[PDB]
């Protein structure tokens, strides 16, 4: 990628924040018109400025544009919780096909320590049947995007099951992760006591549950 | 461009080529020569009485840009700003997208009220002010 | 505002030809260009083609030159603006950096630019074999008896490759369900679960049965939450 | 940005609506054949070039059975089928007593 | 967009069609209605198929004046053999139009379901080809064509029964009615068939029995293969729109 | 403010509402849809004949104020002086006080020799004038 972003913004609610897109003086924003856009990676991509300062219709008129000698920016006054995502930059004329930029990364600070849905669900009669010892644990919204996985087989140093995940950006617009254990029923029953650990600023009100009952 | 011939183009391409439009809408290919010995035939009544609509058609729009200031010409602007709660797309947007088709099915609606409200501050208020402004 | 139906979960092993379709709906597909794009592992989105459906103009990018050519059919008008049409992408001689996620993109009217996007189509261009979902019920949570709510739902142990989609009791079961993130496991295969916040006091006269699905393996196992519970949390 | 009214004349948009319409016939025989039951002595002319104009990019739906011209004609044609005739002689006392044969031969 | 039409001939017949547009490499289905059977269908066809039309019946000219002045014309005497009119068609080259309305049929109606009759009951007019043809009116016979019952998919003699009538007040004339003057001698055609009307087979609910005839008992419909593809719209010269200009002193 | 709804008021009140009087003049609460099977009945040939009348009165004034320069707008003024002669009133008193009901009863004696002179000054002398002042 030739045309370059500023790869991590960090912003607050309720406060201006400036992304700085700079280009070589080929694909430079001075001649080309310019474009920005919200994606999600998974979801639909939003199209935000449809020709520099102009905005597409429906989007709010927080966001604007602005093109120097070579180098184009975004301004975002009163940041949303919404708006934490990886955006994207374009560069194209009426005669040639667009030109993508590298992406920056926006975290949307301010919020809340959103407090998590965590659940530990044990092995039922019909995974225990199939061969397959398992346990896992789910989380829903816990601003910020931070993780700490634990497993304690007795409390001991858990070293063959672990199997963390990348914290995806969930409905709410705040964070969803995974947790696995892939073990075979041998190595499972050589430990009973099975705590989980979530590490997360806060109380010690843990789901501790017991794959044998 | 051809009668009608920019209908299908976008309101800016539609913009550029109006003058046939109204060229043809009168004398083109229908007015002709118009040439027992008396002229009271079927096709005789059938063409006045299609001339009588002919004229209302043009003499209704005629009379309104007789009353704008927009008599002189066919594009002319006036001194009435756009009340955003009729329309809130973007000025360049429908010009190159919308087209005049969907775009008259936009307007028709509050069409009487634009005309309503065309007359008088271009006319019954701006021309209605030489009164006094004419002579200092 | 216009609707666009993307046609997903197609993907074969490198060298073959991938056939990738779009539905257009609601909209006329006549004087509105059409832009694809797919993004690869790197974040790098590269910008694929694009082509208009009215006349045979189309600007390309030099890397997808002889190895992408597209197609394009006649709109069917529905009213007098309104229509429906259907673009084809065909790509040969693909590898392992060609695997990603690829969009179709309606156009806007400075006009070369798309509007709106797709649902999205992720493509894995691997020479590894296809595995089915191995659909588990998972037991009651640990959570309370308060009311009822309380968690239930399913896991998904081993398939190979994504996209999966998974419903609860085909399309009825939608609000109060929370899509787990499918992730890669260290054998190189994916994994994930489902689950269900609903008023369950006591285990009796509710709907526990799910919906699986897959195109290069075709599921149709279906597992209903576990009536011998295994957690304390539907007990006290 | 500052959205002022602009009127435009001779703008390319149209609304499903009938109207009365008329005769478009060439010179047939013109010296022996003067007046067919039809065009009459005094139909109006045709022009030798139409407005072949076609518009791209317009999906007009069409109206087949509900189609407004085709009570048009067929009005027309009857109002001129009591015309024609009117001027000519009236069969009304022609109409009297008929006593008969059948032919010369019978039936063959 | 056209300010004039095409050349539509004003046609005077039932059953077939004369004059007109004939739409290429296909027979076209005209659909005022199709689900429901009690509705008329007419159908334009793809190539012409050429119509001979005489009346070997030689009269002369025979005129006695009524009261003063007023002069009228009758059927003076018969020179020759007595003979019927004699429209006369291809046997083969009908067959082969024939071909694609039965193919076509199997496509927009059910299966291969049964569907053969002749013009059931109506009056001369209504259900035999009645048409104008140098002077006279022809009532020839529709018989020998649904005939010919078929599921899968100069020239030769092919007449029909055909009948003179001068006392004509056609699309029944209550009021006006007209005799047709007999014309002196040559009778010729230099015709066509432009298309055809057809009808229902009653109301029968379900079955494997549905016998289609010829029924098109209307004179709009004739036109209706003519003006299908024509629509009279009204033009609004009148445009407002919005855009970053004004007017001043 | 309504069909000739200025009628009663002073000349000042009539000039400030003379848009709706030629506005519901022509195509109004008259106009309409104007829709045995033949339209030559009674009703036909009355509506017609008055058709004709209807566009003449309008015609001939229409005619004039594109023969004054006029024909753009309402209310045009004209280089034309006023010859004391036809009239001895101050411009203020018949604008609240005669109306123009009375005035046109006043002025339409010479009303013919005022359309003669509005013609030349106006127009066979401001018009012709510019054939030459037009380029230098
Ligand atoms: C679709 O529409 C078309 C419209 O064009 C329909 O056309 C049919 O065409 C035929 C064939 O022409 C008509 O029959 C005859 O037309 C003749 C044309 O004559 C012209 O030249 C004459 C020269 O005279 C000499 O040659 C003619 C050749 O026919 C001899 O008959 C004649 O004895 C001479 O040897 C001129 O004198 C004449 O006036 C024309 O300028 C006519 O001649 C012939 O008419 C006879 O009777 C007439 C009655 O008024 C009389 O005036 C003529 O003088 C003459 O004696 C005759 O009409 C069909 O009538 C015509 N109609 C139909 C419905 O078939 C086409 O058919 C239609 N339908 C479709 C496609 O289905
Ligand atoms: C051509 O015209 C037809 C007209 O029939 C039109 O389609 C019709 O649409 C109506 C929609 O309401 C259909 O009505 C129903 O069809 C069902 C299924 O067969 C019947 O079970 C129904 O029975 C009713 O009527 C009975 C008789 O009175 C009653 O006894 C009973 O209680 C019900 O009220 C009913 O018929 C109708 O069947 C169709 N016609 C068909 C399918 O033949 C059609 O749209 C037109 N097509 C075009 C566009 O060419
Ligand atoms: C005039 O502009 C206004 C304000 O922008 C329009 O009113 C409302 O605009 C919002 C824009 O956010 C519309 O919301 C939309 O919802 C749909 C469906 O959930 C979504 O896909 C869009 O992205 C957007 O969020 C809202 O529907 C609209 N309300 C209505 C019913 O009018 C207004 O419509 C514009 N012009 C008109 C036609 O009056
Ligand atoms: C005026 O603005 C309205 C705002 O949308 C435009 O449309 C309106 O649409 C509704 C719903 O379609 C109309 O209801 C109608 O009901 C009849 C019942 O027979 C049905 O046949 C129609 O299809 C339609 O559903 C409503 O009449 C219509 N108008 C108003 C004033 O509310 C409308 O186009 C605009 N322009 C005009 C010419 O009024
Ligand atoms: C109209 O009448 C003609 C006969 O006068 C019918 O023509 C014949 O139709 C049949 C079957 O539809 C044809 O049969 C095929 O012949 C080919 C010759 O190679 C053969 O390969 C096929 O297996 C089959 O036998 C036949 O050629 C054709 N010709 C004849 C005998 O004249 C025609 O079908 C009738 N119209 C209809 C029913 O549509
Ligand atoms: C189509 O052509 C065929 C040629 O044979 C006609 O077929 C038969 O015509 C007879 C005499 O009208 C019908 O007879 C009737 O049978 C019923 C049976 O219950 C009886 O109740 C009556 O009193 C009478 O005897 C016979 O049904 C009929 N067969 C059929 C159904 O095809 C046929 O009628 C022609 N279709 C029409 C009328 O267009
Ligand atoms: C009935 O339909 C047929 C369609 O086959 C019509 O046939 C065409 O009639 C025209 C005259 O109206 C012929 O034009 C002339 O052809 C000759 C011979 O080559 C040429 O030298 C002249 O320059 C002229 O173009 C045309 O060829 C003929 N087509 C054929 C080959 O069949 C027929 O006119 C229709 N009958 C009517 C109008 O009543
Ligand atoms: C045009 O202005 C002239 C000159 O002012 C008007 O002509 C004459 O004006 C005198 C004004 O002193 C009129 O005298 C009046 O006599 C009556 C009755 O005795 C008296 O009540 C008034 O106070 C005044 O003194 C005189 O009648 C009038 N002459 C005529 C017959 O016109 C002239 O009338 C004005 N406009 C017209 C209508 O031409
Ligand atoms: C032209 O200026 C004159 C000046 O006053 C205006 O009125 C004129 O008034 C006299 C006397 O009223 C008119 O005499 C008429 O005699 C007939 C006899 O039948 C009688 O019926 C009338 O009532 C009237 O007394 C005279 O005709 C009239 N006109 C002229 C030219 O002297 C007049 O209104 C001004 N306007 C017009 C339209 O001429
Ligand atoms: C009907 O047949 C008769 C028999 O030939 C034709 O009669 C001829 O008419 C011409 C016209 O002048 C005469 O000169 C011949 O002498 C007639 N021949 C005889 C012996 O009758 C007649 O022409 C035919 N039909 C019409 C109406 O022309
Ligand atoms: C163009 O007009 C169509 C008409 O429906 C509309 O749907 C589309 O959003 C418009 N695009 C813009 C924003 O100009
Ligand atoms: C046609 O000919 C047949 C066979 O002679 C005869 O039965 C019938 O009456 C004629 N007419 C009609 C209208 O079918
Ligand atoms: C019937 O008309 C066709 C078309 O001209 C012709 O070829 C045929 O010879 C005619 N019939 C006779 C008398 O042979
Ligand atoms: C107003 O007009 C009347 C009409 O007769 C007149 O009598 C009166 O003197 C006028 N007043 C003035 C001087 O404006």
């Known amino acids: 990628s030739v045309l370059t972003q500023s790869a991590s913004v960090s912003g607050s609610l309720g406060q201006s924040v400036t992304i700085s897109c700079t280009g070589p003086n080929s694909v430079c924003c001075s001649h080309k018109s310019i474009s920005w856009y919200q994606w999600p990676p998974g979801r639909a991509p939003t199209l935000i400025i449809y020709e520099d300062n102009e905005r597409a219709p429906g989007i709010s008129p927080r966001f604007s544009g602005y093109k120097s000698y070579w180098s184009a920016y975004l301004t975002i006054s009163d940041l949303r919780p919404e708006d934490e995502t990886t955006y994207y930059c374009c560069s194209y004329t009426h005669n040639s096909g667009c030109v993508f930029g590298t992406g920056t990364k926006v975290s949307v600070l301010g919020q809340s320590k959103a407090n998590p849905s965590v659940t530990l669900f044990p092995p039922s009669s019909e995974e225990l049947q199939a061969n397959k010892a398992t346990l896992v644990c789910l989380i829903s919204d816990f601003y910020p995007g931070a993780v700490t996985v634990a497993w304690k087989a007795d409390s001991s140093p858990v070293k063959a099951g672990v199997e963390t995940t990348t914290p995806s950006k969930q409905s709410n617009n705040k964070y969803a992760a995974s947790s696995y254990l892939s073990l075979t029923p041998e190595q499972w029953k050589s430990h009973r006591s099975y705590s989980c650990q979530v590490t997360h600023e806060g109380s010690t009100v843990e789901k501790t549950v017991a794959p044998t009952e | 461009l051809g009668f009608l011939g920019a209908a299908g183009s976008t309101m800016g391409a539609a913009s550029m080529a109006l003058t046939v439009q109204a060229r043809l809408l009168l004398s083109g290919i229908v007015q002709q020569q118009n040439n027992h010995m008396l002229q009271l035939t079927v096709w005789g009544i059938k063409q006045l009485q299609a001339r009588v609509l002919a004229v209302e058609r043009y003499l209704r729009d005629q009379q309104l840009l007789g009353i704008w200031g927009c008599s002189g010409k066919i594009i002319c602007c006036t001194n009435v700003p756009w009340n955003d709660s009729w329309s809130n797309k973007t000025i360049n947007e429908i010009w190159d997208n919308m087209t005049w088709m969907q775009w008259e099915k936009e307007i028709d609606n509050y069409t009487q009220h634009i005309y309503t409200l065309l007359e008088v501050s271009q006319i019954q208020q701006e021309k209605n002010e030489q009164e006094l402004l004419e002579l200092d | 505002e216009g609707q666009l139906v993307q046609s997903g979960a197609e993907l074969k092993k490198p060298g073959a030809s991938v056939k990738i379709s779009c539905k257009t709906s609601?909209?006329?597909?006549?004087?509105?260009?059409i832009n694809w794009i797919r993004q690869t592992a790197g974040r790098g989105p590269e910008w694929m083609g694009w082509?208009?459906?009215?006349?045979?103009?189309?600007?390309?990018?030099?890397?997808?030159?002889?190895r992408v050519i597209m197609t394009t059919d006649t709109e069917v008008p529905v009213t007098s603006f309104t229509s429906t049409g259907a673009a084809y992408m065909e790509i040969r001689n693909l590898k392992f950096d060609d695997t990603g996620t690829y969009f179709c993109?309606?156009?806007?009217?400075?006009?070369?630019?798309?509007?709106?996007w797709g649902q999205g189509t992720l493509l894995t261009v691997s020479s590894a074999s296809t595995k089915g979902p191995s659909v588990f019920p998972l037991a009651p949570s640990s959570k309370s008896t308060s009311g009822g709510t309380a968690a239930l739902g399913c896991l998904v142990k081993d398939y190979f490759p994504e996209p999966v989609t998974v419903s609860w009791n085909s399309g009825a079961l939608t609000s109060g369900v929370h899509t787990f993130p499918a992730v890669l496991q260290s054998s190189g295969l994916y994994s994930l679960s489902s689950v269900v916040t609903v008023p369950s006091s006591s285990l009796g006269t509710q709907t526990y049965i799910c919906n699986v699905n897959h195109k290069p393996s075709n599921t149709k196992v279906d597992k209903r939450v576990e009536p011998k519970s295994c957690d304390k949390g539907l007990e006290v | 940005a500052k959205k002022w009214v602009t009127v435009y004349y001779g703008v390319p948009v149209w609304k499903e609506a009938t109207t009365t319409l008329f005769c478009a016939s060439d010179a047939k025989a013109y010296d022996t054949e003067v007046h067919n039951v039809w065009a009459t002595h005094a139909c109006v002319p045709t022009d030798p070039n139409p407005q072949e104009i076609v518009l791209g990019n317009v999906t007009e739906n069409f109206n087949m059975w509900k189609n407004n011209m085709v009570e048009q004609m067929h009005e027309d044609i009857i109002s001129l089928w009591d015309q024609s005739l009117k001027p000519c002689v009236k069969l009304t006392p022609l109409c009297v007593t008929l006593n008969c044969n059948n032919v010369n031969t019978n039936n063959t | 967009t056209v300010q004039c039409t095409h050349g539509i001939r004003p046609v005077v017949s039932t059953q077939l069609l004369l004059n007109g547009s004939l739409a290429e490499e296909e027979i076209v289905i005209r659909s005022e209605n199709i689900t429901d059977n009690a509705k008329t269908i007419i159908v334009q066809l793809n190539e012409a198929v050429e119509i001979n039309c005489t009346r070997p019946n030689n009269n002369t000219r025979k005129s006695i004046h009524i009261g003063p002045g007023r002069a009228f014309y009758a059927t003076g005497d018969i020179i020759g053999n007595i003979r019927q009119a004699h429209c006369n068609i291809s046997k083969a080259r009908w067959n082969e139009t024939l071909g694609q309305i039965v193919a076509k049929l199997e496509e927009q109606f059910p299966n291969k379901t049964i569907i053969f009759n002749h013009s059931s009951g109506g009056d001369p007019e209504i259900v035999t080809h009645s048409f104008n043809c140098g002077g006279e009116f022809f009532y020839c016979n529709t018989t020998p064509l649904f005939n010919s019952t078929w599921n899968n998919t100069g020239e030769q003699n092919i007449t029909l029964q055909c009948r003179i009538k001068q006392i004509i007040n056609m699309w029944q004339g209550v009021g006006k009615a007209m005799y047709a003057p007999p014309i002196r001698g040559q009778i010729r055609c230099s015709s066509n068939i432009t298309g055809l009307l057809l009808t229902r087979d009653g109301g029968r609910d379900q079955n494997g029995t549905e016998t289609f005839r010829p029924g098109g008992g209307n004179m709009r419909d004739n036109w209706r293969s003519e003006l299908y593809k024509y629509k009279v719209v009204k033009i609004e010269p009148l445009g407002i729109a919005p855009t970053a200009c004004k007017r001043r002193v | 403010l309504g069909f000739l709804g200025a009628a009663g008021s002073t000349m000042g009140a009539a000039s400030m509402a003379l848009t709706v009087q030629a506005r519901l003049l022509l195509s109004g609460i008259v106009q309409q849809q104007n829709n045995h099977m033949l339209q030559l009945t009674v009703w036909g040939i009355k509506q017609l004949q008055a058709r004709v009348l209807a566009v003449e009165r309008y015609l001939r004034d229409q005619q004039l104020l594109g023969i004054w320069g006029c024909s753009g707008k309402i209310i045009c003024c004209t280089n034309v002086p006023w010859n004391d002669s036809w009239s001895n009133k101050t411009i203020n008193e018949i604008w609240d006080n005669m109306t123009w009901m009375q005035w046109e009863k006043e002025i339409d004696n010479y009303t013919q020799h005022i359309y003669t002179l509005l013609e030349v000054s106006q127009i066979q002398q401001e018009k012709n004038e510019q054939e030459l002042l037009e380029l230098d």
């Open positions: 993109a309606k156009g806007l009217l400075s006009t070369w630019l798309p509007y709106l």
């Open positions: 609601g909209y006329r597909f006549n004087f509105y260009h």
């Open positions: 082509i208009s459906p009215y006349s045979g103009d189309k600007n390309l990018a030099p890397a997808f030159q002889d």
